[PDB]
C-alpha cells in the first residue's frame, strides 16, 4: 500500500549545480511505454 509525503515547493532556483551533456538520440517507443535506441 502506497502513501505520499511532501518533499518541497516547485521553483526555479538561481545557481543550481549546472551539469549533464545534451545528446541527440534516435529512439523508438513500444506499446508498453519502453523507449529503445535505433542505430
Amino acid at each position: 500500500d502506497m502513501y505520499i509525503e511532501r518533499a518541497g515547493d516547485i521553483t526555479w532556483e538561481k545557481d543550481a549545480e549546472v551539469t549533464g551533456n545534451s545528446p541527440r538520440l534516435d529512439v523508438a517507443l513500444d506499446e508498453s511505454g519502453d523507449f529503445s535506441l535505433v542505430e
Binding site: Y3, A7, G8, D9, A16, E17, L25, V27, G33, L37
Partner: protein, 156 residues
C-alpha cells in the same frame, strides 16, 4: 490529506522498512506521477485516499483526483532544472540543457542526469518554475549512463 501544491515522495511499506518507489507533482488538487511508479494503484495522503483518474501505459503517466493539469512545454532552446527528489536525500535543483529523442512521431526533449529508479516522476521545469514534464522514462546509452525523456501529458 495534504493537497498543497509541490513535489511529493511516493513510498511503500510492502518491502523492507519504508521504500521510495518514486515522486510526483501536486497541482490544482491533482497528483501527477509516472505509470511505472504506482502501476495505477490508489495512494494514501494521511487518512485521505487518492484514486486514479487518468492513465496511459504508453505515455507512462497517471493523474489522481482529476484530469492531467501540467501543460507547459520545453522551448527547445533554454536550459531546465530537474527538481531531483532521491530516496532518503533532500530535494535538489540540477540545471541542464536538454538533449533530443528523435522518434518517427517527432522530437521529444531529453535530460542526461542519472538518479536511482526511486527518483522516477521528479519534475523538470522552465525559468518561470512551470512543470514542463517528468523524469524517469528513457534509455541506457552506449556508456551505460541514463538519458531520461521530458514525459509531458495533455491538458483538455
Amino acid at each position: 490529506g495534504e493537497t498543497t501544491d509541490g513535489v511529493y515522495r511516493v513510498m511503500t511499506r510492502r518491502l523492507l522498512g519504508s521504500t521510495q518507489v518514486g515522486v510526483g507533482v501536486m497541482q490544482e488538487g491533482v497528483f501527477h506521477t509516472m505509470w511505472h511508479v504506482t502501476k495505477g494503484a490508489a495512494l494514501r495522503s494521511g487518512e485521505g485516499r487518492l484514486d486514479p483518474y487518468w492513465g496511459d501505459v504508453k505515455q507512462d503517466l497517471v493523474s489522481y483526483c482529476g484530469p492531467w493539469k501540467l501543460d507547459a512545454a520545453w522551448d527547445g532552446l533554454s536550459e531546465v532544472q530537474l527538481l531531483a527528489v532521491p530516496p532518503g536525500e533532500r530535494a535538489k535543483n540540477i540545471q541542464t540543457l536538454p538533449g533530443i529523442f528523435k522518434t518517427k512521431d517527432g522530437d521529444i526533449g531529453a535530460v542526461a542526469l542519472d538518479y536511482p529508479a526511486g527518483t522516477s516522476g521528479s519534475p523538470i521545469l522552465d525559468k518561470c518554475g512551470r512543470v514542463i514534464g517528468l523524469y524517469g522514462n528513457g534509455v541506457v546509452i552506449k556508456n551505460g549512463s541514463y538519458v531520461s525523456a521530458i514525459t509531458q501529458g495533455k491538458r483538455e
